[PDB]
Design a protein around this motif. Structure first.
Motif, mmCIF file in Angstrom:
data_model
loop_
_atom_site.group_PDB
_atom_site.id
_atom_site.type_symbol
_atom_site.label_atom_id
_atom_site.label_comp_id
_atom_site.label_asym_id
_atom_site.label_seq_id
_atom_site.Cartn_x
_atom_site.Cartn_y
_atom_site.Cartn_z
ATOM 1 N N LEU A 32 0.828 -1.195 0.000
ATOM 2 C CA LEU A 32 0.000 0.000 0.000
ATOM 3 C C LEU A 32 0.866 1.250 0.000
ATOM 4 O O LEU A 32 1.973 1.257 0.542
ATOM 5 N N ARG A 33 0.336 2.326 -0.581
ATOM 6 C CA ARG A 33 0.918 3.642 -0.364
ATOM 7 C C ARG A 33 -0.183 4.668 -0.508
ATOM 8 O O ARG A 33 -1.225 4.384 -1.097
ATOM 9 N N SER A 34 0.038 5.838 0.068
ATOM 10 C CA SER A 34 -0.978 6.869 0.113
ATOM 11 C C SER A 34 -0.475 8.125 -0.582
ATOM 12 O O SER A 34 0.727 8.322 -0.781
ATOM 13 N N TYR A 35 -1.423 8.971 -0.957
ATOM 14 C CA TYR A 35 -1.136 10.105 -1.811
ATOM 15 C C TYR A 35 -0.559 11.266 -1.008
ATOM 16 O O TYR A 35 -0.563 11.275 0.226
ATOM 17 N N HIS A 45 -0.941 16.930 -10.160
ATOM 18 C CA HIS A 45 -0.905 16.200 -8.903
ATOM 19 C C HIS A 45 -2.213 16.228 -8.124
ATOM 20 O O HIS A 45 -2.305 15.541 -7.102
ATOM 21 N N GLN A 46 -3.252 17.017 -8.572
ATOM 22 C CA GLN A 46 -4.444 17.210 -7.754
ATOM 23 C C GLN A 46 -5.546 16.220 -8.129
ATOM 24 O O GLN A 46 -5.581 15.713 -9.254
ATOM 25 N N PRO A 47 -6.461 15.945 -7.201
ATOM 26 C CA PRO A 47 -7.407 14.840 -7.389
ATOM 27 C C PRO A 47 -8.526 15.146 -8.372
ATOM 28 O O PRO A 47 -8.899 16.298 -8.600
#
Lengths: 49, 44
Positions: A32-35, A45-47
């Motif tokens: 796992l990794r998170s933003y 880079h924005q959601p």
């Protein structure tokens, strides 16, 4: 990947040829990794939904 | 073919390859339901 594959894997994987068996260390990158979703960068880079 | 009357009560955990045809010549209304699984331990 696969057609209609659901990937919620959270268990450590065997990287290289070093069995982890629950150590999360060398050759045991946790899957796992998170933003870093902060309003700092530009559009790249924005959601989005 | 399984006959239920040891205890003569076979219910082993059978494969599921591409689909299943299931039939029952029954009276005890013992038809309920079924498991389906691949890893049995939360892999999926």
């Amino acid at each position: 990947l696969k057609p209609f594959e659901r990937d919620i894997s959270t268990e450590i994987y065997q990287a290289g040829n070093k069995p982890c068996n629950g150590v999360a260390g060398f050759n045991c990158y946790f899957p796992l990794r998170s933003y870093g979703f902060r309003p700092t960068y530009g559009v790249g880079h924005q959601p989005y939904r | 073919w399984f006959h239920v009357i040891t205890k003569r009560f076979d219910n082993p955990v059978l494969p599921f390859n591409d689909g299943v045809y299931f039939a029952s010549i029954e009276k005890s209304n013992i038809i309920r339901g079924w498991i389906f699984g691949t890893t049995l331990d939360s892999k999926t």
